[PDB]
Amino acid sequence: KILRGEEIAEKKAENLHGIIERSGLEPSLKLIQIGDNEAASIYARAKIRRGKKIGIAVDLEKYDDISMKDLLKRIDDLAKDPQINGIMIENPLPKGFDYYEIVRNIPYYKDVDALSPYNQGLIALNREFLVPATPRAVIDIMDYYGYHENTVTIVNRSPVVGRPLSMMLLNRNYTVSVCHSKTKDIGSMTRSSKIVVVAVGRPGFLNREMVTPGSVVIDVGINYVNDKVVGDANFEDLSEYVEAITPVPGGVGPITATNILENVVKAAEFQKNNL
Amino acid sequence: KILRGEEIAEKKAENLHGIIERSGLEPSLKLIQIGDNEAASIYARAKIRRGKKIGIAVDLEKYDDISMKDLLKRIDDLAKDPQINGIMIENPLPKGFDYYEIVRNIPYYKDVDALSPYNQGLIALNREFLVPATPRAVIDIMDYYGYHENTVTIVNRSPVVGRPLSMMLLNRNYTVSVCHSKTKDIGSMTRSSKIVVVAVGRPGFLNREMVTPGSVVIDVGINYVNDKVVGDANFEDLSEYVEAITPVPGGVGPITATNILENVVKAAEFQKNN
Ligand SMILES: NC(=O)c1ccc[n+]([C@@H]2O[C@H](COP(=O)([O-])OP(=O)(O)OC[C@H]3O[C@@H](n4cnc5c(N)ncnc54)[C@H](OP(=O)(O)O)[C@@H]3O)[C@@H](O)[C@H]2O)c1
Ligand SMILES: NC(=O)c1ccc[n+]([C@@H]2O[C@H](COP(=O)([O-])OP(=O)(O)OC[C@H]3O[C@@H](n4cnc5c(N)ncnc54)[C@H](OP(=O)(O)O)[C@@H]3O)[C@@H](O)[C@H]2O)c1
């Protein structure tokens, strides 16, 4: 009933430290950050720290201010470097810097964030190779707590969450509805599904009216309200009504970083095998 | 009541022509067919023929017996050639020949079938460039007949239909449900959407119990019974009851070839600039 993520992350990371010891890989991950976004820095250091524990070299390159020219070059140099297995650009970026074109000059087998067109392509086509960290982390919860073959409603249709997630759920035999700010009647769809994955970035959004007693709620939102961190779901309200629910913080979030490292391991071994 | 696609194809072909005049492109599309499949040959001739009418050069390369290695060579040759804008391998193939691995060898900007990873990704990313023809045709019908931002239930999760299609409907603000053989109660989900798109390839699959009077059925199945050709829906039955429905043949069917020609224009106007 309380879908915790910390214990799932540790298992993944043990499994992964396994695979590197007795495989002899030495995966490398470059991180690039532009500005001082506090969320992104915390995300960077969590990946450096878990990398260190697992055996992954993860290095952060901060830049106060960089041109498109110099940044594109830097990525180009990193892309060509065979000792660099993964490359990841952190978000948000400054104005006029578009993630989806920048990210495209990273070869897909270095694309650890897995949001480049080629990687989304293979997910779409059910030949998952590198898969984004959050949709990954939602399925982890499902795998770990025992949810299979269900109807799922995703409230979110972004490239980072609900779109690759919808395609990953179909690759695994789930029945899938996606909806969004232009859906006239969300409540109807969310009450009818076994599972509700929610990522609208709006506190209090998923309340009792949106779910049934049989509901399993996976809260992807992260909101700051009163220096405090909270998801999209009225956690307290539902935890006494719904069948199972991810708390925020402590649900999807503890897994993300490790699922990035998971991608860096797959990438580094695909490089060994193929180049 | 009757959702036909010949008006739509004809209109799209005229627009295509105008687009060719008004930029002076001479787009050319290469077809490769390996085998003697009947439907593929019809499809290829339809592309050639509509291509002739519209101002696109479409040329076809038949084979009886090709090796993987030569085909792969031929495709690299066609890809490196700047005077060939489109490349398409017809289906089906010799056994153990994986379509989806051949096609990643076609530059995404030559890939008019739009089934390659890069073009699937751009659809998913809401940055559509070349799009697959059957989902495009579904969206043609919905547009032409006034059906904007509705609930949709697609019964099909293949990469040729329901997957690109789910993504293309989301880019246009529809709300999307996707089901398949492992969905526990399909009727429950089809009856709750304004629009039901079926493409399961099973005659009589979509019957009266799984739709409503307000329902809009788009029937993508192509099935053969008594040499007669039929959809997945139960057409004679559903025509009286449902609000609108596509005939098989004659609904989505007539738009396909032209949608491939649409990508070929797009593919040509992209190549001029790059
Ligand atoms: N757990 C993690 O480590 C992690 C990772 C990634 C993201 N997130 C979080 O998840 C949330 C979304 O992430 P994102 O990158 O997907 O953001 P995004 O691009 O802004 O997506 C927001 C989505 O929510 C939908 N939405 C917003 N308000 C709605 C409403 N009132 N009714 C129905 N739909 C509504 C939007 O609909 P439209 O498409 O129509 O605009 C959009 O699809 C944020 O809270 C973000 O911080 C957390
Ligand atoms: N109209 C056109 O111009 C045109 C163009 C392309 C395709 N099509 C037609 O559309 C049909 C499908 O095309 P495709 O290439 O996508 O074929 P496909 O790859 O075999 O897809 C069949 C899909 O239908 C689902 N399905 C089959 N039986 C089902 C059942 N009993 N209950 C629920 N779902 C079921 C399958 O579920 P699973 O995923 O679980 O197997 C699968 O996702 C075929 O008849 C084909 O000829 C027509």
Swiss-Prot record, chain B:
One of its GO terms (biological process) is tetrahydrofolate interconversion. Pathway: One-carbon metabolism; tetrahydrofolate interconversion. Transmembrane segments: none annotated. Homodimer. GO terms for molecular function: methenyltetrahydrofolate cyclohydrolase activity; methylenetetrahydrofolate dehydrogenase (NADP+) activity. Keywords: Amino-acid biosynthesis, Histidine biosynthesis, Hydrolase, Methionine biosynthesis, Multifunctional enzyme, NADP, One-carbon metabolism, Oxidoreductase, Purine biosynthesis. This is Bifunctional protein FolD. NADP(+) binds at N156, R157, S158, S181, I222. Belongs to the tetrahydrofolate dehydrogenase/cyclohydrolase family. It comes from Thermoplasma acidophilum (strain ATCC 25905 / DSM 1728 / JCM 9062 / NBRC 15155 / AMRC-C165). It catalyses: (6R)-5,10-methylene-5,6,7,8-tetrahydrofolate + NADP(+) = (6R)-5,10-methenyltetrahydrofolate + NADPH; (6R)-5,10-methenyltetrahydrofolate + H2O = (6R)-10-formyltetrahydrofolate + H(+). Its EC number is 1.5.1.5, 3.5.4.9. GO terms for cellular component: cytosol. InterPro entries: Aminoacid_DH-like_N_sf, FolD_Thplmales, NAD(P)-bd_dom_sf, THF_DH/CycHdrlase, THF_DH/CycHdrlase_cat_dom, THF_DH/CycHdrlase_CS, THF_DH/CycHdrlase_NAD-bd_dom. Catalyzes the oxidation of 5,10-methylenetetrahydrofolate to 5,10-methenyltetrahydrofolate and then the hydrolysis of 5,10-methenyltetrahydrofolate to 10-formyltetrahydrofolate. Pfam families: THF_DHG_CYH (PF00763), THF_DHG_CYH_C (PF02882).
